[PDB]
Amino acid sequence: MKQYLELMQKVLDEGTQKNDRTGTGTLSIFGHQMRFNLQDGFPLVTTKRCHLRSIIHELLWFLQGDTNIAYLHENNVTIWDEWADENGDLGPVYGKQWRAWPTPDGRHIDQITTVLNQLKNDPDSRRIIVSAWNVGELDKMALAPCHAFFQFYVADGKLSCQLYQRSCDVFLGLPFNIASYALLVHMMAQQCDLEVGDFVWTGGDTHLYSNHMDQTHLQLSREPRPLPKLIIKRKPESIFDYRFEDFEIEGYDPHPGIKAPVAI
Amino acid sequence: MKQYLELMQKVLDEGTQKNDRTGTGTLSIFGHQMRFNLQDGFPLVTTKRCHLRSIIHELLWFLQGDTNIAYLHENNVTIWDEWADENGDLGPVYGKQWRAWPTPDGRHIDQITTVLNQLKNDPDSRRIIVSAWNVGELDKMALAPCHAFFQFYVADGKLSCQLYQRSCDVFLGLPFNIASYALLVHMMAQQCDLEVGDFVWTGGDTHLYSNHMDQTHLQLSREPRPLPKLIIKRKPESIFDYRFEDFEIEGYDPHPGIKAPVAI
Numbered sequence: 001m002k003q004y005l006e007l008m009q010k011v012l013d014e015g016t017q018k019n020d021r022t023g024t025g026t027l028s029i030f031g032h033q034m035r036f037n038l039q040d041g042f043p044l045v046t047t048k049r050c051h052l053r054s055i056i057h058e059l060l061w062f063l064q065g066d067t068n069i070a071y072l073h074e075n076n077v078t079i080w081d082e083w084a085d086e087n088g089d090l091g092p093v094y095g096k097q098w099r100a101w102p103t104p105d106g107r108h109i110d111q112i113t114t115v116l117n118q119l120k121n122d123p124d125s126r127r128i129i130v131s132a133w134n135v136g137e138l139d140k141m142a143l144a145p146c147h148a149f150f151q152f153y154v155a156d157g158k159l160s161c162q163l164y165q166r167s168c169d170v171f172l173g174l175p176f177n178i179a180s181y182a183l184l185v186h187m188m189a190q191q192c193d194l195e196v197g198d199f200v201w202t203g204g205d206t207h208l209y210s211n212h213m214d215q216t217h218l219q220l221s222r223e224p225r226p227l228p229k230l231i232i233k234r235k236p237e238s239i240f241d242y243r244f245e246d247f248e249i250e251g252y253d254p255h256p257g258i259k260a261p262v263a264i
Numbered sequence: 265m266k267q268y269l270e271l272m273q274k275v276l277d278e279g280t281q282k283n284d285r286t287g288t289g290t291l292s293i294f295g296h297q298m299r300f301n302l303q304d305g306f307p308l309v310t311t312k313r314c315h316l317r318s319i320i321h322e323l324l325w326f327l328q329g330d331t332n333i334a335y336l337h338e339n340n341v342t343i344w345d346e347w348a349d350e351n352g353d354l355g356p357v358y359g360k361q362w363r364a365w366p367t368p369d370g371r372h373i374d375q376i377t378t379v380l381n382q383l384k385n386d387p388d389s390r391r392i393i394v395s396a397w398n399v400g401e402l403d404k405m406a407l408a409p410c411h412a413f414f415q416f417y418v419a420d421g422k423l424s425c426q427l428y429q430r431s432c433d434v435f436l437g438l439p440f441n442i443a444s445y446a447l448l449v450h451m452m453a454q455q456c457d458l459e460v461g462d463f464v465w466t467g468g469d470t471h472l473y474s475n476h477m478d479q480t481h482l483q484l485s486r487e488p489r490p491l492p493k494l495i496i497k498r499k500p501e502s503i504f505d506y507r508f509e510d511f512e513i514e515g516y517d518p519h520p521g522i523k524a525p526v527a528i
């Protein structure tokens with residue numbers, strides 16, 4: 001998509017060489033922001049084929065409050081396999097944090113429910129936020145949250161969401177984080193009788209792994225096609241009730257996929 | 265500063281009318297990002313004289329993990345007066361979450377110490393963060409962190425910082441926020457022998473309260489001046505050792521101050 005492709009070119013033009021945890025080495029920039037008007041089309045990358053199945057399944061898994069890959073397996077999604085223990089566990093990652101952030105006083109807060117309630121009774125609130133960034137549990141997580149905190153906003157009968165992504169693998173993670181947050185907005189928007197507004201993505205260390213440079217230049221040589229269109233076929237009783245099947249992406253015609261290795 | 269006045273103009277030209285919590289009404293935009301090269305001078309508004317002493321103590325108050333305005337008082341700093349209790353407590357706000365995030369099990373994690381250790385031992389790290397957004401203790405705070413979450417980055421011996429500000433008062437709060445974090449980059453940069461890099465500011469709900477329309481217009485017509493320069497007179501032995509006397513500004517020739525009511 002135009003915005004995505006401009007971020008890539010930005011990394012290349014202004015990125016500095018950095019060593020990283022995975023010992024692979026990156027090209028990184030610090031602080032970026034791009035806006036996607038969800039009414040223009042569904043933000044699914046077209047200059048490379050993306051695997052929607054994996055995208056959706058992962059989010060349904062987040063919303064369930066699950067942190068074990070079994071679910072992901074039953075559905076043939078193996079994007080998290082490498083961080084998973086012998087038992088399929090990832091520790092208190094996203095889904096636990098979103099649905100049951102543990103408080104110091106033996107309580108547990110469901111952040112999605114909270115947000116949902118806020119978008120309905122006090123949408124002018126400047127406190128409509130979900131944080132995966134739970135400092136008391138980071139040491140028990142397979143990996144610390146990449147997409148760590150988000151905030152909603154309603155104005156003119158449109159829901160907007162802004163994401164603060166602390167670390168971003170531009171080639172592999174980014175296309176995934178974008179289509180995912182966008183589908184979240186559409187889902188929230190349906191539950192609250194809002195129209196879709198903007199998805200604004202903000203980044204922390206945004207980088208290209210040193211082993212994704214050729215694939216990067218290949219992609220860039222491609223011209224984006226018209227964005228797909230999301231069609232939700234049902235209105236479940238709760239946000240927690242979507243099924244893989246309620247969702248339909250129309251008009252998706254991307255360039256051929258490009259393989260690249262994930263740094264572990 | 266040019267970045268600042270442009271944002272002030274943007275709220276006016278595009279903000280949508282919102283009924284806020286204070287009941288004042290505000291002009292609002294969702295999502296904005298500005299960057300400040302700390303190398304080019306300290307980001308202290310010059311189109312209105314800023315109260316540097318309030319900015320400094322507030323900060324030093326934070327680093328101590330103090331949640332009591334007592335200390336703010338002794339230094340004749342009244343900015344947190346209206347939200348404190350009869351005892352002068354605000355609850356586990358900023359100071360408490362920076363210096364002692366209460367874990368579920370009874371421990372406490374010192375996020376500041378952690379960040380120092382990370383900058384000294386693992387600068388390339390992508391998890392260098394401090395969060396004041398402790399979901400479990402939000403109901404205990406007088407008000408929720410406006411400056412929620414921030415993250416440090418190191419590239420080429422330079423230390424950069426990025427702040428996620430969920431709610432922002434362009435007129436009163438903003439200038440205070442920008443110079444407060446800048447000041448921090450500076451004390452961080454020095455205790456860790458790095459050069460200063462960029463200060464990236466990202467906001468959620470960014471607004472101008474409707475009773476600041478005048479002051480805003482008054483301010484929108486002055487020519488920004490050159491930015492001052494920060495001098496750290498001494499190298500304390502630890503970052504919890506700064507003092508007011510240690511900081512000096514130079515070349516701060518501001519336009520005259522502007523008085524404005526605070527929305528409570």
Ligand SMILES: *C1=[C@@]2(F[C]2N2[C]([C][N]C3=[C][C]=C(C(=O)[N][C]([C][C]C([O])=O)C([O])=O)[C]=[C]3)[C][N]C3=C2C(=O)[N]C([N])=N3)C(=O)[N]C(=O)N1[C]1[C][C]([O])[C]([C]OP([O])([O])=O)O1
Pocket residue numbers: 021050051054078079080083143144145146147167168169170172173174176177258262263264390391
């Ligand atoms: C981070 C995050 F959280 C991500 N991630 C994870 C996992 N996930 C995934 C994986 C893989 C993939 C793929 O491969 N894709 C492909 C295929 C599809 C199918 O097959 O289905 C395409 O697309 O083509 C996907 C997904 C964990 N880990 C990791 C990740 C990434 O991404 N990368 C890496 N290297 N690793 C998010 O969300 N995002 C992002 O971006 N991230 C990242 C950032 C960095 O780089 C990392 C982390 O680390 P630190 O250190 O920073 O912490 O990652």
Ligand SMILES: *C1=[C@@]2(F[C]2N2[C]([C][N]C3=[C][C]=C(C(=O)[N][C]([C][C]C([O])=O)C([O])=O)[C]=[C]3)[C][N]C3=C2C(=O)[N]C([N])=N3)C(=O)[N]C(=O)N1[C]1[C][C]([O])[C]([C]OP([O])([O])=O)O1
Pocket residue numbers: 126127285315318341342343344347407408409410411431432433434436437438440441522523524526527528
């Ligand atoms: C939020 C925050 F946390 C701010 N803030 C606070 C306090 N601080 C302050 C106050 C006041 C001031 C003034 O006035 N200043 C002046 C003077 C100085 C002397 O005198 O000393 C000038 O500057 O001139 C300052 C400071 C708390 N509260 C509040 C505040 C503000 O600002 N505003 C209001 N209204 N209140 C931060 O940090 N930031 C921000 O921005 N904030 C804000 C945002 C909003 O608006 C609010 C909150 O609400 P929600 O709903 O969102 O939560 O705030």
